[PDB]
Every structure is written in C-alpha cells, then in structure tokens.
Design a protein around this ligand. Structure first.
Ligand SMILES: [Cl-]
Ligand code: NA
Ligand code: NA
Lengths: 456, 453
C-alpha cells in the first residue's frame, strides 16, 4: 500500500482495466459462470465437458478471480488514489475514476462470495483483514460511488485521459456511469432491504443515467496482437472451430417462442439451417457424417476484437422499466415501464447487430406491458433481462438470482443431474489462499447452494 | 480438440512458460526462499516467501502451467505433427524437448508427480510417478527427440520457433546438453549414471557458446515485455523490491568478482553492501538507499529469460571432470572449462573483456588446489552464475552438496515456521482436492526430494 513510491495513477488504472477485462473474458471466470448458471451448456463430455456444468468450480478459478479483485485490481486502485491525492495539483477526477472501478470490483466480489474483506483491506497496519458482511460491502460500494460523484470536477481538464480506455477522460460519462452503477446496486439490494426504494426513486427522478450505446462501459479489444480478447485464444487452442459453448434450451426456447431476432447473433444454426438447443450436459447432436446439428454459441462472439461489455444501456433501461413496473420509490406505472422495456430491447438488439427492420418487427410484435397484469409484465421484463445477458455470464448469474424470491426466478431452472448438490447454485466457495493464509477467514466455506444476503 | 498447427501451440507454450518463469508467482518464491536474494525487510519487498510461505496460488498457477498450459498442448502439438502429411518429425523433436524440460522443472519442485498417465482421455485420475521415473522419462523424451529428428528435412517449427528459428542443429546440441544436465542431477542418488555422463563428454557437440543458449527473447514491443519490468513499474519504476543477499554478495566480494556492478546497484555512497534474510534495508537521514538492490537493468522490458546457458553447461562439464564422473578425474581439463564458463558468464552480463581477464587471471588454478577445494570453487561459481535464475539456483544449491555440505552454507530464516532449510514445494490445492490418487497429505517443505542427499 505505502511500500511503493511515486506511480502514475493513469498507468495503474489502465493496468487494472486490462487485467479486469482479461479476467472477465478468461476461462477461469466466463466458463464457471456460464455453465453453472446454465445460460449456456457444454454439449456433453465429448465436446465442452466442463466440470462447471455440474457445479464443480476449480479452486484455481476462485483463487485467480479473488487474486484479481484484491491484488491486481483493488491494491492498485488504492495506490492510484493515494498518488492522485498526493499530486500537485490534486487530481480529483483521477480519484473519482479509480473509486468507481474499485466500487465495481468489490461489487463483483461480493456477488460471488458474499461476506468478504473490504474495510480492512489494503492496509499496511493490518496483516489479516476481517471479513465484512455483504450488506456492509454493498453500502460501501454506494459510498465509493457517492464519494466519486462528490470529488469529481467537470471544469477541471485534468484527469486520467490517455490511459482511460473506457471514456478517454470524459468526466460527464463517468458521472453518468457512477449514478447508473448506484441505481443497479440499489436494485440488487432492494429485495432484502426494501428501504432502498426511496433512493432508487430519487435517481429515477433525477435522470442523467446511462441511456445510449455511447454511454456504455466497455473494454475494447482489438485485432492488434497483445490486445486480443482471451475468448479468441480459447477457441484457437482447439482448432479455431467453436465446439466448446452450446445453445442452452433455457436461453434458446424463450427466444424462439418470442421470435427473437437475436437468435442468429447469439448462435450458429445446425448444419441444416435450423436453430436447436441442448439441456445441461446433453450430448451435442451430429449426423452420421459428423456435421454439427446442435446450435453452438456464435463464433463471432469469440472473435479477436469482441468487446467486453461491463455496463450497458440495455441493462440500465430494463432495470428502469422494472423499477416502474414494481413501483420502487415511484408510483407503479406500466406505461413508463413499457416505454423503457421497448427502448432497452432496441438497444440490446442494436448492440448485437440486428438489422433496424428486424428490431422494429420484434418490438412491434411484443405485447405492450400496458396490456398485461403487473405480474406478467414483470415476468417479461425479467425474461428480456435474462436474454440480454447470455454472453455476460457474471451479470446473468446476478440477474437470475435477483429475478425472483422463494424459487420464482426467471426462468425456472433444474439442478444439473450429475451435480452433488441437491439445489441450484447460489455462490462460489472461498479461495484456497485466503482460507489458508488469513487467520480471520472462516474455518469452513459455505456450500455453493447457500443463498447470499441479497438473494431471497 | 481437432486440427491445430503444431507451431502455434509450441509458441503459445514458449510464451507462457517464459511468462511463468519470470512471473511473481515463480521468480519471487524461488529467489526469496532459496536466499540467493533478499527482500529488504517488511518496509520494502516484505515477501512472504522470505520466510518459506509459498502461496497455494503460486503452486497452483505454476502446476497449471506445466500440466494444462504447457504439457497438454505440447502433447497435442506432437499428435498433430504425427498425423500430418508429410509427418513433421522435427516438430515432434522440438515439442518433446520442451515437454521433457517442463516435466524436469515440475519434478524438481514437487518430487513425485503425474507423468506416464497424464494427458490421457481414458484415465480420469492419473497416478503420481516417482521422481526417478520422471527423470528417466525426461532422458527418454530427449533421446526420442534426438532419434526422430531429421537434419536433412527443412520442414520443422521455424517461424513459430522463437528459440532457434527451426535450426535443428541447435535443437540437437541442446537436447544432448539437457541430457547431460539431467544426468548430473541424478548422479548423486544414482551413481551408475556416471557412465552415460562420460559418454556424452567424449562425444561433445553440446552447448558451448552464447549462440547455443536456450533463451526466450523479450523485447521492447508492447505485448512481449518481460513481466519483471511490469513488476517494478507497478511500484514506481524504482527497483526497491529485490535486494543483494549477503550469501551472494560476500563471496563475490572476497573474489573481487566483476559481475557485482552488473548484478547490483551500489548504495548512494558508491559502496556495494548486502543484507541478510529479512534484514531491513539501510537508508541515511536523507532517505537515500545505502543497501545494494538487484540491478534495475535485470528488470528491463527486454531482459531475456535464460533457460539453458553455455556457462551452466561449461561449469557442469568442469565439475564432471573434477569429480571423475565416467571420465578420469582431471583438474587440468576442469580448470580449462571453469575458466571458459566464468568468461561466458561474465560476458553474458556485459563485463568488459579486460575485467574478465583480470578476474580469471587472479582466480587460483584448480590445478593448484585439492580436489575438494577445486570442487567447492566450481560450486561457488555455479551459485554466483544463477542469482537471476532462481529456479536453476535452487536446483544448484540442493545438488551442490550431500548431507548438509551445500554451497554456500545457509541459515534458516528466523521468522520461518520450519526448523530446517527449504527443499521442495507443497502440492497445489486443485490436484490435492480433485485427484483421488494424489497423496492425502503434502510432504513438508523441508523434506528432501529423491535426487537430493
Ligand atoms: Cl492519463
Ligand atoms: Na432470489
Ligand atoms: Na544435497
């Protein structure tokens, strides 16, 4: 923490950004979350055959991911903040930028592990930091974001700019993002802490939150060697043919019932031109000539320059729609909900490259939320959220758990047949290094089916 | 996993292997635990590995490299080369040499490990082979490589061979040298290897000049920078994490070794001075560094990662002649090779020719020493050569002596739990959990491996 000397905040910020994206798109994160959440499937043991399909998350995967949030990301964001505080002139915007990423790092960590270190982390005086409750951590996330919004200065050109790969130092975009991450985090907490409804309402009244694609928080991979999306390498190592990630029936069937024009963007068809999916661990279907008849996840999503989307306007717009449908700090309003639902679906389809005319057709044909019961309207919003997040398995897993209380999650999932667990997965076990080295860690890790605080 | 280019896989392995060897989860554990370097105390480096606390992530990441990243893909590359038309015999040789070297490195950390049953679809949970099996397996792979290799076939891994660009004469020279090195590792525990060592010495054609070195060339190009540079950039670009160990510096000073300025930076007063394990780095009242840090030049972006060197080879040859391993004991020959190896060592680190001459001139002739004292000086030169190559250093230190006569003599770190010097690593968490044929308990870090007496 204080062992390092003078380090440029921008260098550190970008190092964190690159490794964070590398982590989110890596095999020790993307695969566990996609296969365990069942938003994708592995095509059985002959193909993907991922242990994570039956809830076996490797201790290397938890350790590598944990190492990123605490050593690679957290430690260096804190260091960047310290250098920005100590600079002359004080770089207020750099502090805001770094605090927003730090907030998002701790948010992601607690949504996997629940109770985790935070308040005592990155402290030279504390050898072995205590574990904070998820409730503490999530309120800590909100505080960081509010601290960022307070210290930020839109009339100061000084910021992390050349080393800000997200927004190039445009503090209006960081402001817009910080508010949106607040809103998202509040939506995560509001089932367990209903008193958050008020703060949600206040943000909805204020506006100025992520609303179009230019506002997206996205890490841009490129074709340049050295900045290629790790997902490409994953497929190159098995010959360049995408035979590891398959269309899950939990994803494809709802899309087919709604005639969703994203199907060709999310999946490749079978050899006959037909899109067809698979259950968890169901063997991929081939003909006698060994042609693939099952749908695989689109190879386009595993290309070298595939972007890594961290927070999107679709995501925001469908959450706003949900808030109005549920009347969270605002009067229940299915008219406004419908407007935002339609808008979110348009931005979703646009992001994945659906043609304008096909978007129009899809959105036109979808029932107005106005014409449904509040219960059915909310179900359709939740389903659209589930559809939106197939290629964003971390957000998907949060979304699925958040979507319902007392077994009413959308969509309804079955426990994988060959899993030890009798119940659906709800969290990750703690990393081996933290369990060994930290004397203030739990002696025992909670089981993977034990709900986290936010999850009812 | 279907049709894949062997060259693509080979290069992917090479890059990640170098990335692993120069990474903080390998270089730091080995340098700090072996005590060929020190951390300057808790205010500076403050590395847990100084007190033998090797993280379960570090063992897991390293293990993952040898088995998943390296081994699995080398096997896959070999399979694709076997199935190609025409059969790419040289690619197979190239891949087998690297695979041998991967298993060699793994057994020298963990002892008994999977090998014969690894990378097999029919075997869920592979058994652990004895180190003896693995090391003989390493020799077999190298011999298989030398046999299948074809010097009249232009076809090989060339554009994707970052080491030698497909020059199979260099791979031949290397394979023989790795055999020799591996035999030297085994000969204390298995003295019958002396004969095979003798045979290789008679034949020659082993690594002898810098162009023969197996080295991964990092560059200034973003995307191929040495991880050690990033490590120092993250703490401000000033090298305050790796410090001169007294176990390294003092022997160099008593011999007036001209590598001192290449290995270290002097203190602010121009004096080179070292530190004990975990000893706090010394500063003046003005906060200038008076202790010697490891040279920042060694942490530059294009610092090469040396995997097998001609110094290393030449000092081992010198040792073999000094000990009479399959050849008649011969301190004249040993002296010739010792002098030669020291010259190549100093040259590698950029010592000026005149200063090399002075140093080698001033060193006693092995001829004029007892065989015991001559061997001690060879061992000390080997220890000096490997400061910035901590994996090889740790092998070297353990191999250097039997029954507590290692060179140099080391003390156990004060704040370590262990009562004895470190000898191995504990097994990775994933392998202990997932493999039902793994040991229930990991051996303790002070329990000698098979080769180590
Ligand atoms: Cl900048
Ligand atoms: Na829930
Ligand atoms: Na020994």
């Amino acid at each position: 923490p204080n062992t390092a000397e003078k380090v440029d905040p921008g260098y550190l910020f970008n190092y964190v950004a690159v490794n964070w994206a590398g982590t989110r798109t890596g095999g020790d994160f993307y695969i566990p979350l996609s296969m365990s959440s069942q938003c994708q499937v592995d095509g059985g043991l002959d193909y993907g055959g991922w242990d994570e399909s039956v809830y076996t998350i490797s201790p290397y995967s938890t350790g590598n991911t944990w190492k990123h949030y605490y050593s690679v990301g957290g430690n260096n964001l804190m260091l960047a903040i310290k250098n920005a505080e100590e600079a002359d002139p004080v770089n207020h915007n750099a502090i805001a930028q770094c605090k927003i990423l730090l907030a998002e790092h701790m948010y992601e960590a607690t949504m996997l592990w629940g109770d985790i270190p935070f308040t005592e982390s990155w402290n030279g005086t504390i050898k072995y930091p205590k574990f904070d409750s998820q409730e503490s951590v999530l309120n800590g996330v909100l505080s960081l974001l509010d601290e960022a919004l307070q210290i930020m200065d839109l009339n100061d050109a000084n910021a992390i700019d050349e080393y800000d790969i997200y927004y190039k130092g445009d503090m209006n975009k960081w402001m817009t993002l910080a508010k949106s991450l607040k809103f998202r985090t509040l939506m995560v907490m509001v089932d367990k802490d209903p008193s958050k409804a008020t703060a949600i309402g206040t943000l909805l009244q204020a506006g100025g939150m992520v609303s179009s694609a230019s506002d997206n928080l996205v890490f841009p991979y490129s074709a340049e060697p050295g900045n290629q999306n790790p997902k490409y390498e994953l497929i190159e190592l098995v010959g360049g043919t995408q035979i590891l990630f398959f269309a899950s029936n939990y994803m494809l069937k709802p899309m087919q019932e709604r005639n969703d024009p994203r199907i060709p963007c999310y999946f490749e068809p079978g050899a006959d031109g037909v899109y067809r999916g698979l259950g968890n661990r169901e063997p991929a279907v081939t003909d006698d000539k060994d042609n693939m008849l099952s749908s695989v996840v689109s190879s386009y999503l595993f290309r070298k320059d595939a972007p890594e989307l961290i927070y999107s306007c679709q995501e925001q717009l469908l959450l706003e729609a949900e808030a109005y449908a549920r009347g969270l700090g605002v009067a229940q309003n299915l008219s406004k909900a419908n407007e935002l639902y339609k808008k979110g679906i348009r931005e979703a389809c646009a992001f994945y490259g659906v043609a304008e005319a096909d978007i129009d057709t899809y959105v036109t044909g979808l029932p107005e939320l106005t014409a449904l019961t509040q219960e059915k309207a909310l179900y359709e919003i939740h389903m659209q959220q589930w559809i939106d997040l197939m290629d964003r398995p971390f957000e998907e897993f949060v979304q699925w758990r958040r979507s319902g209380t007392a077994g009413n999650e959308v969509p309804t999932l079955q426990v994988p047949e060959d899993a030890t667990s009798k119940e659906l997965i709800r969290r990750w076990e703690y990393s081996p290094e933290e369990m060994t080295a930290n004397i203030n860690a739990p002696k025992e890790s909670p089981k993977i089916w034990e709900k986290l605080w936010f999850d009812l």
